[PDB]
């Protein structure tokens, strides 16, 4: 709810380059945005649309710069016998970063093989650890052709573990059974040799070829990491969207020996169960939870007829090893809710991680929607607390695809709250939404005396002779926050006397100086300090003016932050928390 949608940072790249197809952060110092442009023309000799990964800075006005992973053209196997084919290789289709490590891959990279003159899409990745940049193509092996790893498309999805292992998905291995490959980042860089095209890694974890019934499964279509057997080692989660006869599945493998741990199965044909997966602890128990996207799931409408809205299943990892699974349906037909699922970290710093789910083809003009969901002790809040809308219309072949890729859990402006990058490759854009800091308010309301005797006429009304039965309304205001936030918080406080009177009943309590039931007051307070209070006198109408003496007179206090004048040095205006009612009530009684 606290993402600033009024003034987000808009980064753009060359048209037609699919700038924003993959997005990530970079925290080696200063921090950066990593954007993939897989259809981008580069300076590589003879390479048409090799693709690139761009490093964009937050501090400066856009100014993105391509990261030179490889400036060379196609290596030759022999004279007039090219070894590889880098044109249209889609480099930057997946970008993944961990500290000073950057992993980018080219899933449509083809090569010749070393046995004959073929053109096989084995996929390749470039890894950049600090200074040294190495290539990583675990599917570019001697196990060639579709039966082997010839069509594996390694790097179709990638991820890092917390113990410096790469997880790579190759959906085409073994006649499109798919494959997960995991290598230690140290062995990848140490054994790299630009004259060796098939490097063997000793600590490699890889799934093996299975029976022909498992062909056409697309294991490795998407990947994610998280611990699921309680041993501290991140385990491998991967969508297998064509498995179970297009019912779709999700495989979980142990991150130590590649043994199968758990399976999930879709429940509807051709819903693409497994298109996207994510793993993050959503209910604050330190057990990572599984999010499985099925963007083509069709649910029942009001008329009983199916409608394609997409579905995300939320699986809470129980301590007993089981899973408590619920399901979250999309809101718009054909919007493909669940196409991307980005863990956001704790977007509002309330102690529970949050997640974003994109419907890249929803909203007006099919400009894309991103839904923000907050976690809590019992799990994921099914109702979204914020809706991020795409602003850029489509004048291209592809729709804007706002939300098709996104990344969270990185505090890029050091304000204490994690932020979110949202890619829109159909319009060649990536957008940074910064989290606004969250104000926790402790308001007070005292009514003394709380029992009101109508015969007790103490105060007199200003300007007349008749006294009234009066009492004091004291309201206190106190605020504080956890992140980086200004001192002066400007509050607008409203008080209404006898708000909960019957429909059409007479207003029984009025303020002394105003003869009005409502009172407004502006309060500039500084956070962390003591509570700022204000006293005021209210009175009852004469006993003959109304009959309801038994209904308690509730004093209602409403307060809102001004937002206008509290902006930070970065222009980031704070916001009140959503879980707390921004009001308080206190009642008084009559004798």
Ligand X SMILES: *[C@@H]1O[C@H](CO)[C@@H](O)[C@H](O)[C@H]1NC(C)=O
Ligand Y SMILES: *[C@@H]1O[C@H](CO)[C@@H](O[C@@H]2O[C@H](CO)[C@@H](O)[C@H](O)[C@H]2NC(C)=O)[C@H](O)[C@H]1NC(C)=O
Ligand Z SMILES: *[C@@H]1O[C@H](CO)[C@@H](O[C@@H]2O[C@H](CO)[C@@H](O[C@@H]3O[C@H](CO[C@H]4O[C@H](CO)[C@@H](O)[C@H](O[C@H]5O[C@H](CO)[C@@H](O)[C@H](O)[C@@H]5O)[C@@H]4O)[C@@H](O)[C@H](O[C@H]4O[C@H](CO)[C@@H](O)[C@H](O)[C@@H]4O)[C@@H]3O)[C@H](O)[C@H]2NC(C)=O)[C@H](O)[C@H]1NC(C)=O
Ligand U SMILES: *[C@@H]1O[C@H](CO)[C@@H](O[C@@H]2O[C@H](CO)[C@@H](O[C@@H]3O[C@H](CO)[C@@H](O)[C@H](O)[C@@H]3O)[C@H](O)[C@H]2NC(C)=O)[C@H](O)[C@H]1NC(C)=O
Ligand V SMILES: *[C@@H]1O[C@H](CO)[C@@H](O[C@@H]2O[C@H](CO)[C@@H](O[C@@H]3O[C@H](CO[C@H]4O[C@H](CO[C@H]5O[C@H](CO)[C@@H](O)[C@H](O)[C@@H]5O)[C@@H](O)[C@H](O[C@H]5O[C@H](CO)[C@@H](O)[C@H](O)[C@@H]5O)[C@@H]4O)[C@@H](O)[C@H](O[C@H]4O[C@H](CO)[C@@H](O)[C@H](O)[C@@H]4O[C@H]4O[C@H](CO)[C@@H](O)[C@H](O)[C@@H]4O)[C@@H]3O)[C@H](O)[C@H]2NC(C)=O)[C@H](O)[C@H]1NC(C)=O
Phi, psi of 462 (to 5 degrees): -65, 120
The answer to whether the CB of 89 falls within 8 A of the CB of 50 is: yes
Which tokens is 104 given?
């980018």
Could you tell which of ligand Z, ligand V, ligand Y, none binds residue 204, using a CB distance below 5 to 8 A set by kind?
Answer: none
User: Can you tell me whether residue 82 is helix, strand or coil?
Assistant: strand
Could you tell which of ligand V, ligand Z, Ca ion, none binds residue 210, using a CB distance below 5 to 8 A set by kind?
Answer: ligand Z
Could you tell which of ligand X, ligand Y, ligand U, none binds residue 449, using a CB distance below 5 to 8 A set by kind?
Answer: ligand U
CB count within 10 Å of CB 5 equals: 14
Bridge-partner residues for 298, per DSSP? 308
Q: Which residue has the tokens 């890729």?
A: 405
Number of residues that bind ligand U (CB under 6 A): 13
**Interatomic CA distance for residues 169 and 332, integer angstroms:** 30
Sequence-ordered list of residues with C-beta below 8 angstroms from that of 78, at least 6 positions apart, any chain: none
User: Can you tell me whether residue 366 is helix, strand or coil?
Assistant: helix
**Interatomic CA distance for residues 370 and 357, integer angstroms:** 6
6 is in an annotated binding site: no
Could you tell which of Ca ion, ligand U, ligand V, none binds residue 346, using a CB distance below 5 to 8 A set by kind?
Answer: Ca ion
The mark string for 395-414 relative to another protein (x by CB under 8 A, - otherwise) is --xxx-x--x----------
Report which of 267, 296, 135, 288 is spatially closest to residue 224, judged by C-alpha positions.
Answer: 288
537 is in an annotated binding site: no
The answer to whether the CB of 312 falls within 8 A of the CB of 373 is: no
Of residues 148 through 207, those in contact with ligand X by CB under 6 A are none
Instruction: Write down the least CB distance from residue 403 to ligand Y, Å.
Output: 22
Residue 260 within binding range of ligand Z, rule CB under 6 A: yes
Question: Which residues sit directly before a break in the chain (C to N > 2.5 Å)?
Answer: 28
Binding site residues, ligand Y, CB under 6 A: 14, 16-17, 39-41, 48-49
Q: Which is nearer to another protein, 306 or 451 (CB)?
A: 306
Q: Which residue has the tokens 């000799």?
A: 45
Strand blocks (E) in 175-221: 179-184, 205-206
548 is in an annotated binding site: no
Of residues 542 through 571, those in contact with ligand X by CB under 6 A are 556
Bridge-based pairing of strands 583-590 and 451-452 is: parallel
Of residues 447 through 486, those in contact with another protein by CB under 8 A are none
348 is in an annotated binding site: yes
**Interatomic CA distance for residues 52 and 67, integer angstroms:** 7
**Interatomic CA distance for residues 295 and 305, integer angstroms:** 18
Could you tell which of ligand Z, Ca ion, another protein, none binds residue 498, using a CB distance below 5 to 8 A set by kind?
Answer: none
Residue 579 within binding range of ligand U, rule CB under 6 A: no
Near another protein by CB under 8 A, which window of 135-143, 255-263, 330-338, 529-537?
330-338
CA-to-CA dists, residue 304 to 298, 300, 301, angstroms = 11, 5, 5
Residue length, the chain?
A: 591
- Residue selected from 256, 327, 507, 589 as contacting ligand U according to rule CB under 6 A: 256
346 is in an annotated binding site: yes
Instruction: Write down the least CB distance from residue 428 to ligand Y, Å.
Output: 9
Number of alpha carbons in the 13 Å side-chain half-sphere of residue 577: 17
Instruction: Write down the least CB distance from residue 97 to Ca ion, Å.
Output: 17
- Residue selected from 257, 522, 544, 569 as contacting ligand V according to rule CB under 6 A: 522
Q: Which is nearer to Ca ion, 195 or 377 (CB)?
A: 377
Of residues 433 through 452, those in contact with ligand U by CB under 6 A are 448-449
Number of alpha carbons in the 13 Å side-chain half-sphere of residue 305: 2
- Residue selected from 329, 456, 570, 577 as contacting ligand U according to rule CB under 6 A: 456
Q: Which is nearer to ligand U, 448 or 513 (CB)?
A: 448
Near ligand U by CB under 6 A, which window of 256-264, 283-291, 323-331, 422-430?
256-264
419 is in an annotated binding site: yes
Residue 583 within binding range of ligand X, rule CB under 6 A: yes
354 is in an annotated binding site: yes
Which residues contact ligand U by CB under 6 A?
A: 229-231, 254, 256-257, 259, 448-449, 456, 458, 470-471
Which residues contact ligand X by CB under 6 A?
A: 556, 581, 583, 585
Binding residues for Ca(2+): 227, 229, 231, 233, 235, 281, 283, 285, 287, 289, 346, 348, 350, 352, 354, 411, 413, 415, 417, 419
């Amino acid at each position: 709810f606290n993402l600033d949608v009024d003034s987000p940072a808009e980064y753009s790249g060359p048209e037609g380059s699919y700038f924003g197809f993959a997005v990530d952060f970079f925290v080696p110092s200063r921090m950066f945005l990593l954007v993939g442009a897989p259809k981008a023309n580069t300076t590589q000799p003879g390479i048409v649309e090799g693709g690139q990964v761009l490093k964009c800075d937050w501090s400066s006005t856009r100014r993105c710069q391509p990261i030179e992973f490889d400036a060379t053209g196609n290596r030759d196997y022999a004279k007039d016998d090219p070894l590889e084919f880098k044109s249209h290789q889609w480099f930057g289709a997946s970008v993944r970063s961990k500290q000073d490590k950057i992993l980018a891959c080219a899933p449509l990279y083809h090569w010749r093989t070393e046995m004959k003159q073929e053109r096989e899409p084995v996929g390749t990745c470039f890894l950049q650890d600090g200074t040294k940049t190495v290539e990583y193509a675990p599917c570019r092996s001697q196990d060639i052709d579709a039966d082997g790893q010839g069509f594996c498309q390694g790097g179709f999805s990638i991820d890092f573990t917390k113990a410096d292992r790469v997880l790579l998905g190759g959906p085409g291995s073994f006649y499109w059974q798919g494959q997960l490959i995991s290598d230690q980042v140290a062995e990848i860089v140490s054994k790299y040799d630009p004259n060796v095209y098939s490097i063997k890694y000793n600590n490699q974890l890889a799934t093996r070829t299975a029976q022909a019934i498992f062909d056409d499964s697309y294991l490795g279509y998407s990947v994610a990491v998280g611990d699921f057997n309680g041993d501290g080692i991140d385990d491998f989660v991967s969508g297998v969207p064509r498995a179970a006869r297009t019912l779709g599945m999700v495989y979980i493998y142990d991150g130590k020996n590649m043994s199968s741990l758990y399976n999930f199965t879709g429940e509807q044909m051709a819903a693409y169960f497994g298109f996207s997966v994510a793993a993050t602890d959503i209910n604050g128990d330190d057990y990572a939870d599984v999010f499985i996207g099925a963007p083509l799931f069709m649910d029942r409408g009001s008329d009983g007829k199916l409608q394609e809205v997409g579905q995300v299943s939320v699986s809470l990892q129980r301590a007993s090893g089981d899973f408590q699974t619920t399901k979250l349906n999309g809101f718009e037909v054909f919007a493909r809710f669940g196409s991307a699922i980005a863990p956001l970290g704790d977007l509002d710093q309330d102690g529970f991680n949050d997640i974003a789910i994109a419907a890249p083809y929803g909203g007006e003009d099919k400009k894309g929607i991103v839904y923000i969901f907050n976690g809590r002790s019992t799990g994921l809040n099914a109702v979204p607390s914020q809706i991020l809308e795409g602003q850029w219309a489509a004048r291209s072949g592809c729709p804007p695809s706002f939300g098709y890729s996104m990344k969270g859990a990185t505090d890029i402006d050091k304000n204490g709250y994690p932020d979110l990058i949202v890619g829109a490759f159909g319009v060649d854009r990536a957008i940074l939404y910064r989290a606004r800091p969250v104000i926790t308010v402790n308001a007070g309301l005292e009514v003394y005396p709380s029992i009101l005797n109508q015969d007790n006429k103490t105060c007199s009304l200003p300007g007349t002779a008749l006294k009234v039965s009066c009492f004091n309304v004291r309201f206190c205001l106190k605020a504080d926050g956890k992140g980086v936030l200004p001192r002066k918080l400007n509050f607008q406080v409203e008080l209404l006397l006898d708000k909960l009177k019957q429909k059409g009943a007479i207003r029984r309590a009025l303020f002394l100086y105003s003869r009005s039931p409502s009172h407004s007051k502006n309060m500039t307070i500084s956070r962390g300090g003591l509570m700022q209070c204000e006293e005021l006198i209210a009175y009852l109408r004469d006993e003959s003016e109304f009959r309801d003496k038994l209904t308690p007179i509730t004093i209602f206090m409403e307060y809102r932050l001004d937002y206008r004048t509290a902006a930070d040095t970065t222009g980031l205006q704070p916001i009140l928390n959503q879980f707390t009612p921004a009001n308080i009530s206190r009642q008084a009684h009559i004798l």
